[PDB]
Amino acid sequence: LLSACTIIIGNIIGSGIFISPKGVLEHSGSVGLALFVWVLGGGVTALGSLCYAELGVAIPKSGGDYAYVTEIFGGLAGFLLLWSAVLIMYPTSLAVISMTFSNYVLQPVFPNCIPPTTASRVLSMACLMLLTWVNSSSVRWATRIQDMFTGGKLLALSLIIGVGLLQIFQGHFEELRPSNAFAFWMTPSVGHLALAFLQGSFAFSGWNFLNYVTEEMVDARKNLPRAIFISIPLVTFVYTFTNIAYFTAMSPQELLSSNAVAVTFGEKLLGYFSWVMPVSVALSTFGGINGYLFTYSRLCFSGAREGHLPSLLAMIHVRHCTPIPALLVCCGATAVIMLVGDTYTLINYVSFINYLCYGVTILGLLLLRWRRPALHRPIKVNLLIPVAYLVFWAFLLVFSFISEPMVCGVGVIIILTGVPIFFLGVFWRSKPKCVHRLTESMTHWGQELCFVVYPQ
């Protein structure tokens, strides 16, 4: 139970608390509203995780949202979700993490003036290529470095919490007083709260990945809900304490005008020893990238296992047993998206599509409950939780389209474009000799280029 709890905490926690605070503050307009947004997100993710756990214990099949949606709706929705996974959340998430790594590295060099875009983008791409090569090299090395990355991230968070506790003990709580905590510098419209929630929900991303590994624990039914109860509120409290430490370290404008919150925190509170901690945050970003690559490869394996994706994306190396074609494809995709925009827009985009997919799957769970009430479900949840999730999801989506329409519209366009390709790929089963010949030629070319074989 405790080991599973640590698994949930490790999967949920990540380099999101190093990107969120500026975006949350810029929309909330006050410290108290930002903290309320944080705690509300920490509760809503708990609710969604509980409902997802109920869905996962209902269907012992593994594969996450992909498998669950393929089970309830069918092939079309499952392939649409897989398309959204391979195209949006994994590449945008990798690009965001790399960009924040570059920002955090270059901020001490240029403390006041923004670093050049070319250098930051080049550094991010170099880090990404290094990570892709490292993951392609081996697996035991990769997991060892991932474990030490997790150690570095937990060390950074522990030091931040300790410094915050030391500062609050000595009596620096000027901003936390209700006179200054609720000092609104701008009236927040409903869209501003929605965008702040979207920005702040990036830190919790990855809480779905426990369903991706549902087939590798013993007695999931007993430990899993208790695992959520112990883990997620602890994560919310940790994020709350980190935000409190940041706010005791700085002031609203003193924090918003910063490209990297943690490095300025170290340089203004820790003192001469500040140089150590940006390395820690960079190591945390390294770990996030490595974990995302692992989840990517596993997702591609699951996707090509069913057969909507071409079989070339699940083949392993003959010697090292690694799926290099998928890694190269994703590296290209994220390198493409990175040289387009900024961290803020990408975060909004990926969080919106995250919530859209979560709502789609939760609606699928509700449809399964309505259609099929007679199957044995080890755990049962009261309908208030799903109806609350549905109403919050609806309100959030309408607010997202109303306030900032471009990113949600383009995301909807890209996911909808996955329907005709699905119809021409899977629903169209009488492919002529030309299409089959091209497919097999590409298959053989991939085999001879990558030296990979189908897993046994």
Binding site: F110, N112, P115, V122, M125, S311, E448
Partner: protein, 468 residues
């Protein structure tokens, strides 16, 4: 499905494909190494940040002189304890200081009786002053005392010998820095003989106690020579003088006055004010107040305003108010002597909820001066203007730039902005936003062209454009 067998692939990839992988692996590794080298090369050859100047406390906002406490609150509340309730109002104005007083005991023209170490009981007791400091300190409103030896008499420094006066000032200083004041002000130094030596001594003592204590001097001279003759020995002295007292309603003349004064002193810190203990309205008409207030905040320096200036309060336009200490109008009942003689436009209460009121202009301007890096310590560059225009750029390193155009004339003109008078890093753009205008009828936040712009008579525009 279709795929190549493991044994089949091993046979196929043996003869010549192995060389291809090694070449591709070496090529990809070489590209990564050069890619990292390029970033470091770009980083090394990148422009570096400019150091911050470590501003003191009298740099990030105006000062709010208070000539007389009796007229600031009115009858029945002329006490330091009553003033303690006003600090919420002052913090709304976001002033960074109050030139309070003077409050030392001085009956009439008596050097022996005049004691600068004892607070007159009429204004309150010492405990009230101490309580005032803590409330002000908690609200970050640094209190500056006034130490003019004679304020109830015709001569501010007595007709007798002044050596004993100097000792009294020094004794008052060491005592009052012990109390906890954050500066001092001496007015009417014209009547002080050889005042340069005393100012150097007092500034030496004031800076000796701490590096965050300032001395403010005030004289009524209006020419550049005696002002420089007083600032030749001392360089960290804020001097408020009637240098801009004459208006002339001519933008070119004001442009000359500001530019020459800065050029003569180099680029040292200055204080912009129209007098030492007088309001704006004593030298300007009603339509120019919204114009000067934009000029004083945007110029490089620490604006110094008298009490009742945010509302444009005037004593000559309302009978019963002495010109020296007009009574501040807090509400419709703030002047019970002549009921019905006051309006809602002349009181602070009636202007707090009006976006177009004079006080609203003060509050938004004071906000911009107190936070933006360009207005705080940015370089001030003034280029060629129109026949009666006055314009300048407030730029600082990579931060957002500011442009202000003032039309002191009464005839509508055009911008006529001329290039080749700014540094390469401060070149004007084709399009620039619009922050605020002195008069209603303009669209705020709308990017506006900088070549076909036209000026309404008696209008000042504040525009912002980021780095180009």
């Amino acid at each position: 499905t279709g795929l190549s067998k493991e044994e089949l692939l091993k046979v196929a990839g043996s003869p010549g494909w192995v060389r291809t992988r090694w070449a591709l692996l070496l090529l990809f590794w070489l590209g990564w190494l050069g890619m990292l080298a390029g970033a470091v090369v770009i980083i090394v050859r990148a422009p570096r940040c400019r150091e911050l100047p470590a501003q003191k406390w009298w740099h990030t906002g105006a000062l709010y002189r208070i000539g007389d406490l009796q007229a600031f609150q009115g009858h029945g509340a002329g006490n330091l304890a009553g003033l303690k309730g006003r600090l919420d109002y002052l913090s709304s104005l976001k002033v960074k200081g109050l030139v309070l007083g003077p409050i030392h005991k001085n009956q009439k023209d008596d050097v022996a009786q005049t004691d600068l170490l004892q607070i007159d009981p009429n204004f309150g007791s010492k405990e009230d002053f101490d309580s005032l400091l803590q409330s002000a300190k908690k609200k970050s409103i640094r209190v500056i005392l006034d130490l003019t030896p004679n304020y109830r008499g015709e001569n501010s420094w007595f007709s007798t010998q002044v050596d004993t006066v100097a000792t009294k000032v020094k004794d008052a200083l060491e005592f009052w820095l012990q109390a906890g004041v954050d500066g001092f002000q001496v007015r009417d130094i014209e009547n002080l003989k050889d005042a340069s030596s005393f100012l150097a001594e007092w500034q030496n003592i004031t800076k000796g106690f701490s590096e965050d204590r300032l001395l403010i001097a005030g004289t009524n001279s209006s020419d550049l020579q005696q002002i420089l003759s007083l600032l030749e020995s001392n360089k960290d002295l804020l001097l408020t003088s009637s240098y801009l007292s004459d208006s002339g309603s001519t933008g070119e003349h004001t442009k000359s006055l500001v530019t020459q004064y800065l050029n003569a002193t180099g680029n040292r810190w200055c204080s912009w004010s129209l007098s030492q203990a007088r309001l704006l309205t004593s030298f300007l008409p009603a339509q120019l107040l919204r114009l000067y207030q934009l000029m004083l905040f945007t110029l490089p320096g620490t604006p110094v305003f008298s009490y009742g200036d945010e509302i444009g309060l005037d004593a000559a336009a309302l009978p019963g108010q002495p010109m020296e200490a007009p009574v501040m109008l807090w509400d419709e009942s703030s002047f019970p002597d002549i009921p019905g003689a006051v309006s809602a436009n002349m009181t602070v209460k009636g202007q707090s909820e009006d976006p177009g009121s004079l006080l609203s202009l003060f509050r938004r301007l004071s906000d911009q001066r107190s936070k933006e890096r360009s207005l705080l310590h940015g370089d001030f560059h003034a280029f060629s203007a129109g026949p009666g225009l006055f314009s300048y750029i407030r730029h600082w390193d990579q931060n957002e730039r500011f442009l202000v155009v003032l039309n002191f004339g009464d005839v509508g003109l055009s911008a006529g902005l001329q290039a080749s008078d700014l540094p390469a890093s401060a070149s004007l753009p084709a399009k620039a936003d619009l922050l605020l205008s002195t008069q209603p009828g303009r669209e705020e936040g709308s990017p506006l062209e900088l070549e076909r712009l036209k000026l309404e008579p008696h209008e000042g525009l504040l525009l912002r454009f980021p780095y180009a």
